[PDB]
Design a binder for these strands. Sequence first.
RNA 1: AGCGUGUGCCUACCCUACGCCGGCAGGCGCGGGUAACCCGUUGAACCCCAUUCGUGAUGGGGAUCGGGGAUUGCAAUUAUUCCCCAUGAACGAGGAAUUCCCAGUAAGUGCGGGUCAUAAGCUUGCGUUGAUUAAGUCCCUGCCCUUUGUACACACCGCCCGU
Lengths: 138, 99, 189, 62
Amino acid sequence: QSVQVFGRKKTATAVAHCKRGNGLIKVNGRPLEMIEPRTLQYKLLEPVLLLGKERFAGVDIRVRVKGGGHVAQIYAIRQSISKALVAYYQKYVDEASKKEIKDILIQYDRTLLVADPRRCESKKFGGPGARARYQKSY
Amino acid sequence: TKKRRNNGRAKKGRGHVQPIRCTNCARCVPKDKAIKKFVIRNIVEAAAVRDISEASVFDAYVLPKLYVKLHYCVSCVIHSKVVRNRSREARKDRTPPPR
Amino acid sequence: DIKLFGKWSTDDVQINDISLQDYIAVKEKYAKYLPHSAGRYAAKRFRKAQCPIVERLTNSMMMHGRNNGKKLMTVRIVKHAFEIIHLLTGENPLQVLVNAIINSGPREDSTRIGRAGTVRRQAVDVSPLRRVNQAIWLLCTGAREAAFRNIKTIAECLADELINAAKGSSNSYAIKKKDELERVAKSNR
Amino acid sequence: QPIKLARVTKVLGRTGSQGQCTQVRVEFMDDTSRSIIRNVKGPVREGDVLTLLESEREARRL
RNA sequence: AGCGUGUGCCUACCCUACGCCGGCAGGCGCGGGUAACCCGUUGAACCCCAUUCGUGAUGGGGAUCGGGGAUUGCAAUUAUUCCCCAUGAACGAGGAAUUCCCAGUAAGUGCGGGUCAUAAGCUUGCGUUGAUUAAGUCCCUGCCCUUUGUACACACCGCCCGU
């Protein structure tokens, strides 16, 4: 059928349609280290220095990348590429090579599969916020 | 009411017992009523035994002991937490603590 | 071209030991190519020290009310003008990490005394974790409360602290304050 | 002033008016270990290394 | 951003898009929405950005306080109403006395709901930026579980002694 979960984190999402195609090196369709906010631009250069040029000649990952928030939209591209390699290798040859590159990527950094569960908590009685209380007079 | 059967002292079969002075307040307390402790400690404390032993001119000098006899009045024995107040039934127990 | 990572090597880079990872330990899932991770270090104790003293120094510099937590500034400190000088030095790059603290590191402090009196302080020392906690908490706090309006201001606030942060010297100044008071406390024996 | 590694076996606890000091028990690894109790502060890892940079500082209780 | 609100039964006092172009909310028109449908991918936005200070009483942050067109309210001044020209604000940690607070928390920051005619410096919620400290104690203020003393029981703000 069609198995497609793409990449997402916190709030943002990189829809990663994985199929055969050109599959050039592009982030938001843009060059290697060229992103306008200019903050976390190295995170993708690392793996492609190990395998070689032949390996990305047939992996087209068409990404709809939407979402404001750096720690969301960044750190979701790493999740997306991890899942892209995982699915490609699992479906094509065997899960041992997927085992290997997933091993290096995930044991390399824990925080792809795990997102921050922290979120703004509820405001309560008699206070300006969640924990603070109004000044008590005597 | 009569709190203690022995009146809180150890005077049985005599009329007068000589008094002593509490080591803390110098209060006159009868020798049977006074609470007596006998501390046999080391002249040099544990944190200072090792350094004294290294500095000793004699090998295995075996350090001397300090023998001190303390007499407390009831107020000073209670304040210093040597003895505490006990329940009506636990008061009758004369067994010393195991230590 | 068999060198590991982008700045290290394995053929002839010998440290003749492995026992030199007291504050810096990057061998597991806690690796991210840049120290930009956001994240929390107050969820439970000992976590401020588990932040490696390099990341602690550069990222616990978030005090006062103008630069309180904003990680773009730690990104600037460690990202811009340090990876370049790592090779622009020409010499052995270990000097910057190994020229800071091995003689600076405070090895004792003390605690309040009795019910009346403050003229002395009962000596206490710790395993590295709480000594780093207390000593550099007070170090960062003093540096921020007094060094507000700093001539040593960011876009050049990598060199001095990255040379007097990790290990290998006795040259830091709030550290000299805490070491002199360390001797004062050490006098309690 | 030699730093000796010490492994923590038991944390005695906190001392002070409001609680401001710590006390633990430590022993050597393979150096004719003695059960020597010293003051620590805060974080003590599982089998941490107290710095007996001095063998004569046994922090005194009471 | 996200929590939400929004009109014909006494609501003819709803939320507003788009065109009026004196310089944009806006007094005039013309439409949408009883709403995951229109306002709305939330109508003069945060943090950020070579107006820039290689040091700091300056450009860097608002010291009473005047205008250009006025949201349109029986008055407003005797509580409605909108950007700016650099004349300096003790312009960079604060009398005894104290309040609140342990992570998406304090604090900063704005946006909804209630009140209501748009009526908020109030409250009640919602996001957004985001920490320093602590993983302890019974020193203070108090609470609880036991033993103990009491001449108190209106229960120590008790009872009570002597000119």
